[PDB]
């Protein structure tokens, strides 16, 4: 008889899915925030490349 084994496994599997769901929720929230951080530093470094290029151009002239 295999119903007991089936019901036990169904329980363990639902608990596996429940737990990963929870982790997936927390982890995506973190990623969405990361996407903003990544674009702030993007634009800050681009700014600094530009300023740096300008300055160098100017000292070269003298």
């Amino acid at each position: 008889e295999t119903l007991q084994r089936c019901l036990e496994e169904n329980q363990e599997l639902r608990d596996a899915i429940r737990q990963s769901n929870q982790i997936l929720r927390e982890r995506c929230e973190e990623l969405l925030h990361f996407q903003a951080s990544q674009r702030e530093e993007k634009e800050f470094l681009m700014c600094k490349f530009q300023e740096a290029r300008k300055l160098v151009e100017r000292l070269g002239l003298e």
Partner: protein, 39 residues
């Protein structure tokens, strides 16, 4: 459950999207800019 099974496919879809747009903006790398004014 299958509220669970539906919740997992949706969690996964969100995950794939999130990583796709995290791993996207990377594609425009400042390695491709003109750095020759250094040299």
């Amino acid at each position: 459950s299958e509220e669970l099974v539906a919740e997992a496919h949706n969690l996964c879809t969100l995950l794939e999207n999130a990583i796709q747009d995290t791993v996207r903006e990377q594609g425009n790398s400042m390695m491709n800019l003109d750095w020759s004014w250094l040299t």
